[model samples]
Target chain A: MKVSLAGQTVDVKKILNEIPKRTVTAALLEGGEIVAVEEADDEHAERKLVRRHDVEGKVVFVTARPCLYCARELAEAGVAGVVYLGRGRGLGPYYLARSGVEVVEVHPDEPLGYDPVDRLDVLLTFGGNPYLTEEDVAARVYCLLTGRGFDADIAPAPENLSGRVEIMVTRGDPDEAVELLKEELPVFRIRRFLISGEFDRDELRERILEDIEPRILDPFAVRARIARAGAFSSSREAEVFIGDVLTSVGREVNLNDPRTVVTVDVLGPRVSVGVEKR
Target chain B: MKVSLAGQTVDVKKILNEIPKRTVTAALLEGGEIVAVEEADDEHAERKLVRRHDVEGKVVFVTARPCLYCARELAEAGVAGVVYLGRGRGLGPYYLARSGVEVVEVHPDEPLGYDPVDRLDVLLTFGGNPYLTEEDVAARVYCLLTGRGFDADIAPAPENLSGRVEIMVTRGDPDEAVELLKEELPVFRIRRFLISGEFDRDELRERILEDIEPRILDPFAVRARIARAGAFSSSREAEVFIGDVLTSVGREVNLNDPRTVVTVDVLGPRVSVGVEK
Candidate 1:
């Protein structure tokens, strides 16, 4: 059997064979599905296992979160080094760790409005099939937020501009787009930012109310970001171009990162913006 | 705010308080969410920054996998610590202990399901909610799995048995109930069994010929060890008992470890049996 990874396909059995011997700290047999975390020569095996294993820094002799009674009993038995997940939140980690389970934080990627192993699998790996294109996924997200739905545009990334658009919200009207955004996402935050000007002295509200939010931001914040200094002819145009750049936040979003950059795009939307690393 | 965890309510503020001072290793403002991870008092603050800066190490900061170009650039720029939940079967873990970012192993319980700020505030300290039960969550899991069209049954525990009616099948004709079972769950394994010297073996043969497939096993050969060992008084009694146990398996399922154990009940002509883990 063959499985695809990093935009390529490789032999599953061969990849499994390359897993580092004895590096397997633990294995999780979730129902009929078997997963593991072990060291290996091949990149695929390591990636698969790391992807599957929840607990860090310890190995499980038998992968299963023991019941409270069993866990207490094991504590009495001096059985240490167990990792448990999904045991009723805050209490579970401390209780299990105190009971000798060297627990760490782990959670299943709970993609929005979907089942655990089905579209979730797709959502996590590629964000949804049929709607594989980022645009269609964005549309579904929009539908979810607006309480209205649409037929999925089932196409892959390139067709839907996976990393094509960018946003350039002026420092002023960002809060307005944020208001529209509040209607959509349940939990979200604007992590780390660079302000063009402080509201105290600047004509921020006027700029935002008149030009920024109306032209570029409110519709695209989920898919874009404002261009940095020196990037666009004006901040207005820059914000309009940086669509889905938030999708580039953090280090895990690899497949979409190749074409993303923060610094270079600051050359204004006209000079042919390029990405630059800070 | 209150949070439901480990069958108890906890204060989100109080939990935040317990986080060691200077615990802010790194922070992000994204999508109207302020996510941070705080490691314990001991580990290197820099090394543990990844945990202190995100949502308990479970929620993926980057939604895409491997993060090839961006991740490489981050690494090249000496980004301290970063983690990635790669895509496909395998092709990345580029997520551990980079210069600017530290990749950490993310597990199942970290995201806290409901957001920490709002819902966590409602769960009172030292209180439990009636709606928050393992069965409830597992039922959701059932809904999730079935929605995907996977063949499965949420085998209820014996304690949850409700359909007080009992239907019996001869040791030979076990599939008599297949149509009944087909009403909801259609897929199956290990459907029949028999015991030795408990009933007229000839009657068993006759029943098998009448209702079941010819390739079926006699109760004597398949499960009589229980009867022979005195686990049950007679094969007839054991047949009825099996169905009683299947209800148990459905109600409580262990996603971690599953043991293959089948059930048997024999009560006169009314014998019921089923298999479970």
Candidate 2:
């Protein structure tokens, strides 16, 4: 469901910074009058912070990355409640508090990006066409229902999943719509789930090779290199130690002009994976 | 004088596409190792790209944004000929080329970063200290001459103002140095200039703040509410325009946010500017 606040509407995640950071003062407005001002912790600033928290019934799906600075401003505006949709890290949620606004953390996966989808009221998509269609969403739903693990059976949309999916249809901000999806989607422990109960490996593999290569992998590789880093660790916990060693080796021997390189990283439980830099 | 590229080292900048839309590929090491690889481009696979460029010297500054992914990696490797710095807009000179290395375009600036200095020739210093203390190799001499419309005293150092200032401290990986600086310095613009004869304040002010902000004078309260849509002349120009408007309103809206916003869209002679919530 969409909720509009005053004449200007924003997402819940966007308002997270207000709750944590008392630096901002807000005012709530409804229909055109002041309803509430999320009074700041300060006494003197309270009088100057007279505004309203407008809660109209229209919502935008906000992604998790509600900018820190933007969050504080929204809270000072006296916004209603926020639906925090943190995708990558909970940094978005962290910022929402900075603005002194309350938030309800919502995502397909709460604790980790890897979570399952058990129930679904709505899927407010953003970023890319998460694989091109509602069919892809359904197909993934099916994969989870069938007990497939994360990163398994899940396929990119055959159409290349180019532009954004949610904000593409709306006139509002992409960030707002993303948050709605995060709150509305199921908060399972894993990110992927079997929505349709079927899998098409050949088709999915083709998508990975074609669209995934130049887009995700290559771009990510460059980011890694600048950090002078090596392969990603099996998990975030082991990243610091593994990164130190890999970086040392990269510098000790000039590996600048390697011909057809191979990328390898340590995974958990005594296993390593390698991939060609195609 | 510019040194010849005999025993000098360089990190190659890979050009991804045609002019303007180009991106950096892999940064080559002195001994031909592909030290840093940038995001991939069309017409090429994900593999790294290395190439040669004609330049005056072998030494290059990673004036481009530091290799975001491989920065720490390169720092630990003891790589040479790299100087990192930032130019705000992009990876400094690295961004200027989009991708592919250029010798003349990249150089060390006055206030250099410390990490890159540790890897290269000059040692990095922080806490707002003067970069030079006379003990360095070559001094960057400034002229005791004066400029037009100025009333300031000029003094000379130990050598001629025209004397060439050596690359006292070249960034270890000039590309990565640039990247690192770009990331750290949210809004920074570093310029290299030898004081010819005298100092000019007006000139410096104009250079720094010229066209910096787009002013919307709601002084007379001319317009009602300005839409964010019309904030900038065009969407791409919004960054510059927003900064301009923020300054004019007497409200230091954090680049991140500010209430009582304004937006404007104007035609050639017909200008549009107003306030937005």
Candidate 3:
């Protein structure tokens, strides 16, 4: 469902978009390497691999029976590189190589070797979690972006860092870290900068009022919950902050709860405040 | 935070819309009785009782004090009825009543006596939950409505049931109930009609395909969860249905697991096919 390509994170949804419709079977690529390929049977009810092709870069092609002969023709057709979807089991790949055709095999559900730097726009970091993996982070970020109506590409780690947002999932000071990130990369935007530690509710309220109130904001009430990790901040701080923000905007505090949630983390270097809603 | 207004459901969002800005304190009404009141205080930092001019017909009024004098004036101002926020203590209420000002008092977090039927547009039902009361149903309905961008009013029970949609939450035969309800009240639209008993997944999928596919739908993929309340069904049923529906529309199945979840409950008469996302 998800794959890392050229240092960028891509999922099925993104891959599907580039493909034409009624495409019950197809192959996916990353920098001239085959990542995965699917095929529908003649009846279109089931599928099997006909062959392989190593087509690289951002281009996609449609062909039946991506066999050795077809791959060689595609290589002769001047593709940057050819990606083979099926196993490199026979003489076809050897013949393609003898004729100076470059090819790489990639399996479905596996990370690609190519760097997805240019396609990725976000980087994420977390304190730690044995259950949470790089793939989990990528999936989570992908969901957030798509839900917000953005076509996002995630990079599990920093690669081509400029012009991309960095999200830190920590139980430390979020605001300070956000401020520091801002200073370090003034042109970059940050998101989901959560602060996840213990803090006084009243004190946090006063801080946000002084720091965040000046901006013209949409008037609405919010409910918040703290996700504890390495820190011990009370969830009450989220409630207090939501209440304070509502009051500032002349809105009442809602507890059947609001449609949106303001999340805070306090374990990083600064306090991170982010809004997520359903 | 949430209140039942007549058979209709209303929430804080709807209440606040009736209130003008800079309104330090105010009282809300239904059938001329006070449902609730809100007030700001001195220095505008805090407020309580404040009175305002009489505004009638399912209204909210702001005032400096909602005491005896204010209630009397509100009554005298020709409101259909005066809803008092505080106790009906002393002769002010008496004098108002003597003058034919109908009054009712309501406490915070207490269910109001007002009938909100005329304002409601939806009705919801569930098989049974001991912890849930009519008031709880009203509050929940209010939340669902407001969350969907509709300014709704909750009616604890049906009053005028001719035009509204009915949502049934039962563990019996939901499809049969839905069909029966449709036959009985042709005008009513059903939503979230969950069935909660044993059923075949293949049967349900076929039933939905035959029953629901004709309706024009928004193009989207759905991740579904089939909750087995008292009975059980295959989770693979969810996967099968998802794939089937997507294939019908020529869309690929997704596992990045984005938004829009379709929930199914298989427990009643007929197979209930509800599209929930």
Candidate 4:
């Protein structure tokens, strides 16, 4: 996920976020070996090309620029540059050119070319050897949940909480899946509450944030961590920002002792908020 | 030179600049004993009260606020606070209180108080052991210069090069002093070119700066270091700033290999420029 452009090395994998898509079966590779295959987009392509990486100057790679909306979004997010494939004039390309971002159109072979189709999926937070394959854990969860005669699948962990996984129970009762996994798994189960749609940084002021009130049942505080996907804002800035947004929605502030904690992650292109009923 | 203020420890010495002044015979103190004092203003008092110190939260302490001039200078310098003595109601006092600066009017005994009439002087930058007394240094330099039948006195090293000394040649030619010192001392004799009087930071644009032209010969460059006096600007910022100021007056920049360097020290309240040819 690295290439030479404008005479300097650009790291493409660090800034490109993955999205999960079953239409694409991705295989994870390390040292040019097929480690595991997951139902993901960008997952296999990235997990493969990103091996011989460890470069600097994070620059996002994309196959195409659909319109001006993405151009502004990437620029406003303080993205230093965009090493994109496909060539075009005016509109989205020019919009980025006007901004300070380094918009360089390269060939398909450059940077191994990225596909925006792939994404993350049910991430299992596990212990012991971090080198363990993801497919093994998915098989364990798949068997455990399926053995109980229920509907469940591995989904990306809540913002991939480092040591956690998402057991997707697409309908019926998530509790059946939760309890089944709890009995067979560690008590480190994180409750899920998808309270936000992916949005830009400045868009945090939108009324959609008021929806956070439904989760803030008691005095609470916002704990935020900025994702490596974007250095546009800092963790401290996000806390005060999202904290202010949550407060306007009748949520009491309690940085010390709080009944509920609203967690926010500032992903480059979007932000995700999760609430825990403490 | 540190004290407690607003419930936090304050370091007063680090921010205080030392100035030279004779007739006020002083004695440097050490271990509650006199270390060595040159003819200086705060040389003795600061060197003494400064021990048992080394605190944080840089704060400027003065016995009195002469006027609104200093009030704004210290405030504009981004100084955190002014731990002064006098209790005044209007003007400069209020100016600071409103400037977002911690204006604490403490009792004289609080931080042992400080005298505002002191500053840095002909500094002697030396080595061997940093723990040596200033008197011993003066005794050596004084014996070296005066023994040659010349009028010379040991001043603080220039910005206290930390490893050098300033031999004052009040009159006649300084070369005699320079050459004599070179014969006995190392070739560390700095050429003197006092081109600037004490001025504020933003005042660099003053027309007086064009005077730097006389010093620039062949390709020249500016090298600046911000004194601990003010964190208002960074060293890199100062370099570009004074560099631009010097360039406007027919000076060529050769940062890699410049024949002359316009050295600038951004003292909190003023800036001093020294050109080495």
Expressed as tens digits, the lDDT of each residue in B1-277 for candidate 1 is 2212222222323332333221112222233133444322234223343433433322223322333443354344444333222111111233322333443222211221211110000000111222122222223323333344332222211122221111123222324333334332322122333321233534544443333323322222223212122435765444433322222232222324434333344333323223332
Please give, for residues A1-278, the per-residue lDDT of candidate 3 as tens digits. Answer: 23232333333345555554464445555542336555555532112322354343322222222333444444454443233332211223323333443332222111212133331112343321111123223333443343334444444423212112234333334444444433332212244422222346565555556544433143334433333223235557555655666576564445455554454543322244555443
Tell me, by lDDT, which candidate is best. Answer: 4
Q: Give the C-alpha miss distance for residue B198 in model 4, angstroms.
A: 2.1
Give the per-residue lDDT digits (tens) of candidate 1, residues A1-278: 22221122233234334333453323432221234544433433223343555524323322222333333433444333343222221122223443334433222221111111101001101212110123222333333323332222112122122322122332224344334433333112212122233232124334333433333212223222333333334544544443323333222223343333332122122222222222
Residue A188, candidate 2: alpha-carbon lDDT: 12
Q: Which ten residues in a row have the lowest lDDT in candidate 1 chain B?
A: B118-127
Q: What is the TM-score of each candidate against the true structure?
A: 0.21, 0.18, 0.22, 0.28
Q: Note the DockQ of each predicted structure.
A: 0.02, 0.01, 0.01, 0.01
lDDT of 2 by residue, A1-278 (tens): 11232233332333443333444333343332334444334432223332222333321123333333334444555543344342332232333332334443222222212222222111222221001122223223322222222221222221222111111212333234333333323211111111111124344224334433322222122111111122233344233332333343342212354322223222122212122333
Q: Rank the candidates by TM-score, best first.
A: 4, 3, 1, 2
lDDT of 4 by residue, B64-107 (tens): 33136555654565545445432211135557666766553322
Q: lDDT for every model?
A: 0.29, 0.27, 0.37, 0.45
C-alpha lDDT (0 to 100) for residue B270 of candidate 1: 26
lDDT of 3 by residue, B28-135 (tens): 566434565654433220113223323443443332213456556555555443332321112344454455544322222222232322211223444332222343
2 or 3, which is superior by TM-score?
Answer: 3
